[PDB]
């Protein structure tokens, strides 16, 4: 209903935190609640921060891929930056990255960019996995990936950015996204020849 009464949800979250119920809830339930809170731009971030902190490392250790990506996406859309939640997220990603769908990979990459994630190994290996499975990427997934804030940071190697660029040239058909990708290629650290060829393909 896009209903915005944040006092009611604040009372509900206070009851959730006080009852120590965040240590027994399911991963998909946590993701659904966080996504619902983020979909309406919840105001009181202190309650959400306490609720996310209260959950234990046991839950973080064996979360499935999709609830985990939902949780990190809801964290990113709520402008939450937590130093100790992100290390748990990173080790869980290290464990279960191979099962991510392409749209999950794009969501993870752009959400981690949106929160200014400082780790580079996890980002680099996620980008490598995305490059390996480039032949299956849809249109919305490419928009989500190449629409990330610091996308040019991730376009480090030619191997990790060649199939993604050719797939974007083949599939993406929006002038603004192509211009943004060309600008990111210009600001990237790729070899000059590949940048020139990709810019030629995308624009013109």
């Amino acid at each position: 209903k896009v209903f915005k009464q944040d006092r009611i949800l604040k009372q509900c979250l206070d009851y959730l935190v006080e009852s120590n119920a965040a240590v027994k809830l399911s991963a998909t339930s946590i993701g659904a609640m966080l996504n619902s809170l983020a979909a309406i731009r919840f105001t009181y971030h202190r309650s959400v921060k306490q609720f996310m902190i209260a959950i234990s490392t046991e839950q973080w250790s064996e979360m499935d891929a999709s609830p985990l990506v939902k949780i990190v996406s809801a964290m990113a859309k709520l402008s939450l930056r937590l130093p100790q939640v992100l290390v748990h997220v990173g080790d869980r990603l290290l464990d279960v990255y191979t099962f991510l769908s392409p749209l999950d990979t794009a969501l993870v990459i752009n959400s981690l960019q949106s929160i200014g994630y400082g780790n580079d190994e996890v980002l680099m290996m996620l980008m490598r996995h995305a490059a390996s499975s480039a032949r299956r990427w849809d249109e919305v997934s490419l928009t989500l990936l190449f629409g990330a804030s610091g996308v040019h940071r991730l376009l480090r190697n030619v191997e990790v950015a060649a199939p993604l660029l050719e797939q974007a040239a083949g599939k993406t058909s929006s002038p603004h996204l192509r211009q943004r990708i060309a600008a990111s290629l210009r600001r990237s650290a790729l070899p000059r020849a590949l940048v020139q060829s990709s810019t030629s393909l995308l624009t013109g």
């Binding site: 399911s26 998909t28 339930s29 659904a32 619902s36 939902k70």
Partner: peptide, 30 residues
């Protein structure tokens, strides 16, 4: 299978395991 006799059982029960395998957002609400 006739022995099931129209009883889905645990595979079609309401348990948390079966309720934790879908991504609908629980928006409309049962």
């Amino acid at each position: 299978n006739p022995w099931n006799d129209g009883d889905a059982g645990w595979r079609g029960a309401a348990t948390g395991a079966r309720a934790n395998r879908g991504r609908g957002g629980f928006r409309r609400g049962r």
